[PDB]
Amino acid sequence: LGFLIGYTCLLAAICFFFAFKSRKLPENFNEAKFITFSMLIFFIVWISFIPAYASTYGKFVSAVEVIAILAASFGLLACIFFNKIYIILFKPS
Amino acid sequence: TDASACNKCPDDFWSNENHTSCIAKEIEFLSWTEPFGIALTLFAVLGIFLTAFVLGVFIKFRNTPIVKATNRELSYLLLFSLLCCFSSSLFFIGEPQDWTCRLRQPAFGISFVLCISCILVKTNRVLLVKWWGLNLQFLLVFLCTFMQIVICVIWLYTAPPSSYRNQELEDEIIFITCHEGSLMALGFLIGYTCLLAAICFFFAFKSRKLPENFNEAKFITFSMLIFFIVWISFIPAYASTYGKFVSAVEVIAILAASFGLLACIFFNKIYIILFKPSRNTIE
Ligand SMILES: CC(C)CCC[C@@H](C)[C@H]1CC[C@H]2[C@@H]3CC=C4C[C@@H](O)CC[C@]4(C)[C@H]3CC[C@]12C
Ligand SMILES: C[C@@H](NCCCc1cccc(C(F)(F)F)c1)c1cccc2ccccc12
Ligand SMILES: C[C@@H](NCCCc1cccc(C(F)(F)F)c1)c1cccc2ccccc12
Ligand SMILES: *[C@@H]1O[C@H](CO)[C@@H](O)[C@H](O)[C@H]1NC(C)=O
């Protein structure tokens, strides 16, 4: 499980690097803000739950995982696709 | 030898494994020399070191007019506030003595207000939206800070925090925590800080596209969003921990908020002042 977590964290860091390197692309092709904010949301949510995962081991040890998953993946969705959906529907160009 | 009835062990004491003698319960609490504590205080001191290095950079290149466009004098106050905010994290990791519990939250609160209000006042387009010219921004930020100082002082005078020694969670382990007394004053403190941060976020949200000193108003927005993310994810992370790892989560949130405020907002200037694009600064 530790290696399974570490590989995902490493790919998240590589995602950070790719977002930083893709900073200068035109507006439609530049998603550096959204990628970096998604990765920040994922990392912040999962790091903040470290004491909870390391201390509680009852019913809350799985509720913590559920809320952390539903926060990280929802942050991914909101950061990546929500702005594009808004710019397509609410403010067409 | 011949006991008609075993007598209960006294307070702060517990029976041995074989119920022969009595031993004392344990003073479980977050401290240093722990796999969790040492890394955390290492991160705190690293934050202090980075903040001091950035302050030294701003002092060294103090005459270059890259920094002169954003109230250079106020930047030192911001950096000192960041020092104090980082240092306030070390209060949650120590022994929960009497004085620590009375000050751990107020210290970080005054630090963060002296930080966010200073950022909000820093906006050169809002200073002018005869006591001006020599000190105008300082008084405006000082009123906002002073409001928080007085609410802190009324909370510290009316219902001072106390170092609650709690042993109901574990019968054999004593947990040294901190009690606040009146939670409504702490709620008012947190609400006022959040309102000030939201005001800063709103004021920075309208100037995203203006490249005022390297698109600073966009990174105000980024830092405020990071702060709100951190303190909205701290809510479920806090009301889940039971034990020594409860003063280790608010301190993690403090470190995250301080990092988001410092790096996002100053590294723009730092990566141009001293890095390879050194000959990219201009008036
Ligand atoms: C230092 C690490 C550990 C955390 C801090 C975040 C770093 C990686 C990020 C936050 C915002 C980023 C900056 C965003 C925009 C630009 C403008 C560009 O013209 C030079 C790089 C620069 C200035 C980036 C450098 C990297 C940066 C400072
Ligand atoms: C859902 C989760 N299962 C164990 C959580 C351990 C954990 C608890 C608290 C904090 C952290 C972390 F921050 F260190 F990641 C991990 C999981 C499963 C599979 C892959 C994952 C990749 C990243 C994160 C979680 C992953
Ligand atoms: C550090 C953090 N409070 C710590 C205790 C949390 C708590 C513990 C127990 C009860 C409650 C609550 F019920 F009041 F919410 C909260 C804090 C301190 C100061 C200013 C702040 C401003 C913004 C964000 C956080 C701030
Ligand atoms: C039982 O209690 C403790 C074990 O934790 C031990 O120190 C003590 O000597 C024991 N008493 C006996 C074996 O009589």
From Swiss-Prot, chain A:
It is found in: Cell membrane. It comes from the Eukaryota. Changing N30S: In HHC1; decreased G-protein coupled receptor signaling pathway. Expressed in the temporal lobe, frontal lobe, parietal lobe, hippocampus, and cerebellum. Also found in kidney, lung, liver, heart, skeletal muscle, placenta. Residues 18-33 are annotated as: Intracellular loop 3 (ICL3). Ubiquitinated by RNF19A; which induces proteasomal degradation. N-glycosylated. Residues 18-33 are cytoplasmic. Residues 57-60 are extracellular. Changing Y53A: Does not affect G-protein-coupled receptor activity. The chain crosses the membrane at residues 1-17, 34-56, 61-82. Changing I67T: In HYPOC1; increased G-protein coupled receptor signaling pathway. Changing K33A: Strongly decreased G(q)- and G(i)-mediated G-protein-coupled receptor activity. Changing L1R: In HYPOC1; the mutation shifts the concentration-response curve to the left and increases maximal activity. Belongs to the G-protein coupled receptor 3 family. G-protein-coupled receptor that senses changes in the extracellular concentration of calcium ions and plays a key role in maintaining calcium homeostasis. Senses fluctuations in the circulating calcium concentration: activated by elevated circulating calcium, leading to decreased parathyroid hormone (PTH) secretion in parathyroid glands. In kidneys, acts as a key regulator of renal tubular calcium resorption. Ligand binding causes a conformation change that triggers signaling via guanine nucleotide-binding proteins (G-proteins) and modulates the activity of downstream effectors. Homodimer; disulfide-linked. Interacts with VCP. Interacts with ARRB1. The extracellular regions of the homodimer interact in a side-by-side fashion while facing opposite directions. Each extracellular region consists of three domains, LB1 (ligand-binding 1), LB2 and CR (cysteine-rich). The two lobe-shaped domains LB1 and LB2 form a venus flytrap module. In the inactive configuration, the venus flytrap modules of both protomers are in the open conformation associated with the resting state (open-open) and the interdomain cleft is empty. In addition, each protomer contains three anions, which reinforce the inactive conformation, and one calcium ion. G-protein recognition is mediated by the intracellular loop 2 (ICL2) and the C-terminus, which contribute differentially towards the binding of the 2 G-protein subtypes G(q)/G(11) and G(i)/G(o), resulting in distinct CASR-G-protein interfaces. The C-terminus confers selectivity for G(q)/G(11), while it contributes less to G(i)/G(o)-coupling. The C-terminus adopts opposing orientations for G(q)/G(11) and G(i)/G(o)-coupling. This is Extracellular calcium-sensing receptor. The chain holds residues 773 to 865 of 1078 of the full protein.
Swiss-Prot record, chain B:
Changing G187S: In HHC1; decreased G-protein coupled receptor signaling pathway; does not affect cell membrane localization. Residues 61-72, 203-218 are cytoplasmic. Changing N215I: In HYPOC1; increased G-protein coupled receptor signaling pathway. Changing R208W: In HHC1; decreased G-protein coupled receptor signaling pathway. Changing Y238A: Does not affect G-protein-coupled receptor activity. Residues 203-218 are annotated as: Intracellular loop 3 (ICL3). Expressed in the temporal lobe, frontal lobe, parietal lobe, hippocampus, and cerebellum. Also found in kidney, lung, liver, heart, skeletal muscle, placenta. Ubiquitinated by RNF19A; which induces proteasomal degradation. N-glycosylated. It comes from the Eukaryota. Changing Q105R: In HYPOC1; increased G-protein coupled receptor signaling pathway; does not affect cell membrane localization. Changing I110V: In EIG8; patients present juvenile myoclonus epilepsy. Residues 93-98, 159-182, 242-245 are extracellular. Changing I252T: In HYPOC1; increased G-protein coupled receptor signaling pathway. Changing L186R: In HYPOC1; the mutation shifts the concentration-response curve to the left and increases maximal activity. Disulfide bonds join C9-C22. Changing C194W: Increased activation by positive allosteric modulators. Residues 61-72 are annotated as: Intracellular loop 1 (ICL1). Belongs to the G-protein coupled receptor 3 family. It is linked to Hypocalciuric hypercalcemia, familial 1: A form of hypocalciuric hypercalcemia, a disorder of mineral homeostasis that is transmitted as an autosomal dominant trait with a high degree of penetrance. It is characterized biochemically by lifelong elevation of serum calcium concentrations and is associated with inappropriately low urinary calcium excretion and a normal or mildly elevated circulating parathyroid hormone level. Hypermagnesemia is typically present. Affected individuals are usually asymptomatic and the disorder is considered benign. Hyperparathyroidism, neonatal severe: A disorder characterized by severe hypercalcemia, bone demineralization, and failure to thrive usually manifesting in the first 6 months of life. If untreated, NSHPT can be a devastating neurodevelopmental disorder, which in some cases is lethal without parathyroidectomy. Homodimer; disulfide-linked. Interacts with VCP. Interacts with ARRB1. This is Extracellular calcium-sensing receptor. The chain holds residues 577 to 870 of 1078 of the full protein.
